[PDB]
Each structure stands twice: as C-alpha cells, then as structure tokens.
Write a protein that binds this ligand. Sequence first.
Ligand SMILES: CC(=O)OP(=O)(O)OC[C@H]1O[C@@H](n2cnc3c(N)ncnc32)[C@H](O)[C@@H]1O
Length: 656
Amino acid sequence: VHHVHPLPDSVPESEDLFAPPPRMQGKEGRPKPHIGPNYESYVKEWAKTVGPNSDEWWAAKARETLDWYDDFKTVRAGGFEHGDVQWFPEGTLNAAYNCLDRHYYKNPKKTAIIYEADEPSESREVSYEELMQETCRVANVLKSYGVKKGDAVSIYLPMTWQAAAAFLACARIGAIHSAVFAGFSAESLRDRVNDCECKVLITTDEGRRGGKTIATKQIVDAALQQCPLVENVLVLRRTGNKVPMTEGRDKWWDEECAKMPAYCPCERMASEDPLFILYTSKPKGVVHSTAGYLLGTALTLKYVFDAHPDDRFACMADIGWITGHSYIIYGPLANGITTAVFESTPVYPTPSRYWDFVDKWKATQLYTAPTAIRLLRRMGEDHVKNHDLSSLRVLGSVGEPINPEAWHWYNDFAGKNQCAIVDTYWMTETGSISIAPLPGAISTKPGSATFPFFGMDVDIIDPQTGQVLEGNDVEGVLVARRPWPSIARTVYRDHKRYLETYMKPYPGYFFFGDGAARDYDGYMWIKGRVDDVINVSGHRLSTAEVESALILHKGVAETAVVGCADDLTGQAVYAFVTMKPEFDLKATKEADLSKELAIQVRKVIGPFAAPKKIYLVSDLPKTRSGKIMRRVLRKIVAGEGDQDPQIVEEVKQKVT
Ligand SMILES: CC(=O)OP(=O)(O)OC[C@H]1O[C@@H](n2cnc3c(N)ncnc32)[C@H](O)[C@@H]1O
C-alpha cells in the first residue's frame, strides 16, 4: 500500500521492471558497460561523487577527462546562497581544444559529425580535420572583426554542421556565444541580441527544415533594425538563394573564411570564464562557465549513454536548446566520438526518417524528446517495424515526462526490446543530465528518471511546510543540496533573478521548479512543473499523472491538462486531447469519448481526478524544444486570452 504510485501504465507493476538487456551486458560483441551490472555498482561509484570526501574523485575525473593548460589547485568553492559557485578555479583550458584539437591530433580522419541534411541524399561525414579547419577559419574571421576574449557573439544558425564550427570558434577565442533557435521571430531574436550586447552575429542566408525554407537572413534584417550594437554579420551560404546583404555590415562566410589561415591558436580560459549564454523560452540568459560545464557534459555523455570510442551518437535535437549544446556539440566532441547534426524533422520526408537514419549510419545511441516519440507513435508502426536498428544499444528521452505508453512504444519498436531506455531529467540551468539510469546498471521503470547522476544529491521538500521529507515513498518538490560542476553560474547581468528563482524559494537548496516523488524502491519520478500542479479539493494532481492516464485510451495521441478555479473543488482539471488522425470522430460520439476518458482517469488515479471538461483539439501549443505550453492553455481557460503559432487560435475558439 504505497503512498507514491508509478505513472499510469497498462502493464502491471510486477511485469514492468526492465533489467539491462544483453546489448548492455557486454554480450553479442557489444562493449562492456562502464558501470554495471546492477544497482549496487551504481551506488558504489556514485557515493564517491557526493559528500564530504568527494573532492578526490572529482579532481581525478577532471584531470583524466579534459586536457588542461594549467592545473587547478582547489576543487570547489562557493554556494547557492550568493551564487559564487566555483569549480577547479585556478585551472586553465579551452573547450575547442578539448572538443577538436586533441582529437584531431590523434585521428584527424575520424568522423566528428554525421551531417544528416534535410534531404537524405545530401548527408555526409565531416571529419575532425575538416571541422577543426573550419572552426579555425571562423575564429580567425571573428578575431579580424575585433572580437576579444569575453565578448558575446550571437548565433542564429539552423541545424547545418557548421553550427558546431560557429560555437567552437567562439569558444576557441574566449568569446561567449549566444545561440538562438533558427526560426525564432525577429522580435525574439532582437531581445536576445540586445540583452547580450553582442557586436557580431553569425547566421545563414536561409535554413531548410522538413522541406520548408526558414528565411533567416530576412528575419535577421528585421531584428537588426532594432539592435544598434551589431556591426558585423557573418552569413553562411546554406541555400544560395538571393537574400539581402547590407554593404559593410554583412559578409559571406565562405569569402571571409577563404582569406584566413586554417589554424588559429586557442585562448587560454580560466575554469570560470563564461563559455556561453543560452536564453530560455522576460528572456533569461542562462550562463555556463567553462571547465565544470564541459566536465559535466563529458561525464554524462560517457556514463548515461555508455559511450565508447567508436560510437556514433545520434542526438536529434536542435542546437538552440541546451540539449543540443550538451549532447550534440560539447559532450560528444569532448569525448572524441562521432555525433549527429540532424537538419530535418522526425517525419520528413516520411515518419521513417529516424530509422532510415539509424540503419544508414549504424547509430549506437539515439536521443530525442517525448514529443517526437509521441509524434512517431501517432504515425503508426509501419514506418519502424521493418528496420534493423540493431546498432542501437541506448535510447534516451529528454524534455518532459515520458508517458509509460510512449516509453513502451519506444522500447518495443525503436529498441525491439533490446536497448536500454534512459529517461534523462535535467534543465538548461543544470548544464548536464541530473537524474537518469546508468544503462548498464539500473533496471528501469516506464516513466521514471531513476537515480541521481554523479555529483547530484537531491531531496524532496514538502512545499506546504518547506521541510525535507526523509526516506522513500514521499512526494513534493525536487531540490538539490549541493552545487555540482555544471550548474549555471548566473543569469546574464541579472544575478538577482538567478538567486530569486533558484536559491531563495528553499534556502540552502537549489529549486528545480518540478514536482517529484521518490518511490519505495528509491526511484525518482519527475511528475511535471510545480506551476502545473492542479489542486482538486486537497488532492494535488500532477500533469504527468493525468496525461499518462488519458493516453491509455485507444486512439489518443497526446494530451495536456491544466487547472482552473472551481468554487466547489478549489481547482478543476481541464483536458486538451489530441486524437490520432484516422480516429472516426463521427462514429464515436464526442460525449461518449469524454465519458470513457473520465472513467479511465478515475480508475487509475482516483475519483477526484476526472476532468471537469475535455476539449478535443487537432494540436497543442508547443515550443521549439517540444515543451507543451500548458501556461498558454491555463490562461485561455482562465479567460485571460489577451495576456505552430496558428494552434493558439484554434484553442481559443474551442474553449469559447
Ligand atoms: C534538458 C531540458 O529539457 O531543458 P529545459 O528546456 O530548460 O527544460 C527543463 C524542464 O524540462 C522538464 N524536463 C526535462 N526533461 C525531463 C524529463 N526527462 N522528465 C521530466 N521532466 C523533464 C522539466 O520540467 C525541467 O524543469
């Protein structure tokens, strides 16, 4: 009789525990896991990484994992209270040296980047030699513009391989890159370009994604009319179609680079020099420093994905997201392996694209978001069932709770029940993965992140008392007790917002902003955003709970639940429901559908959790990174409609 339940699943709990499969046991010729074979092997190593004697392990990992120009003396200092976190502060290094040069010197012809172009036939392999040469040319171009160590440089590039060169060119010279999702509006770009006070911007003439053109240079020209500090724009000729160019201000990437040497020295950076600003969707400029962030991405890539030297790591996200920062560029390249830069969408030209890609390149790990998974689940198993896919050993999911229904579709079809599924919980502000199974050690539960990564010591606080809940079978809000190497160091020029958002809600701790539970086995369950909890008559419902109930119903593709004021219950659950496209809405009475959905939620969660209203909609408002914008739904249901962008107009109409 447990207080904490797993996310609703149609599989009974007793048949729902997944030991590392043979591909993660060193069988069938696969590499032996770095950590394994059981929970105890994870604990035995994890315990070295937290607490009063963890400096020894961190100093050793720091020294074994990165090439340093100057050694460090102190392992860590500072803390949450004033936001003065420090790691390896006396050391010096360069992120570009660690992600390129050192691997170029060992095996220059090894592939750094699998460039999977929007059109499959234009894909190709980019070696470490080629990536480094292009990075050095661009660095030299930036130096020629007068960019100095510590200057900010904005990046508005789509998912072409040169995006990594632009990141690493900034890192190479100590410039602070600020990457913005290609396709963000001129207004969103202007706000982020203005906030970081950059003088140089790197972009493309046009982007291509899913057979559509992103008019990047045209968007840039609109933003720059309200960005008085930008003096130089470097324009990558991605499509070659005619775009406006401003004399003096704008230069073609290829023509600037052709004038420059193909080597450029590395600036020697202090461990705590800023490496980048990454605005989250007022715009919050999240700042990461250099050594701790790089170390955290290198270690998490290695251990969470059990990366080995010949691996071909395929993270399918966008470099505008922290996920692309940490697990397309920095993490994999720091480890010297091969990494995918995926330019297209999961369904272009067909929903078989991910799997055609895996079998073409023999990818050994695939990493994507629940939104993509549920998208492909909606599209039917014909596009996946007849692929090989046996080069994969680890399938990861990042960005939101993964409903057990989607977890199982991932495990059965993408993994053919032979891959480990790593559900990776973290945030832009954590730098690298915070809670995840180690795939060779941890028996997984559908929808659970399982146990904290090395250096992470997390706790559950009761938000109603402000006090920590000791033990297992407890739920509340997730906090961390101690800094870890890759935590964000500030919000750019707004340190007060940093302290107030993360350090002040529960003094002594870092506050993630997510509801969480630790079950009787000690497994962590991230249940959704705290802001998204719905309090019905005292019962605190999480989004992941109710949404996982609704998706147990045949035909349901995706849902989102938001609360709203109710005189009788305090708050009422309103559900927005997306059905598969072939589901006959005329042959099933809408009222009949919502009655069955209500009964379904009442069975697996309780009599109080049924939605007061259900809205059938064709899609849900989502961000570029695939987050469902529940805050948008909540505000429309609250009648505060004034406070795929076309999807908002549809919701506002169905609710009225
Ligand atoms: C990496 C990233 O997503 O960065 P970011 O864009 O900053 O979002 C952070 C928010 O995403 C949610 N989130 C991300 N991964 C999750 C997971 N595996 N399980 C449950 N929730 C997850 C949480 O709510 C986070 O607080």
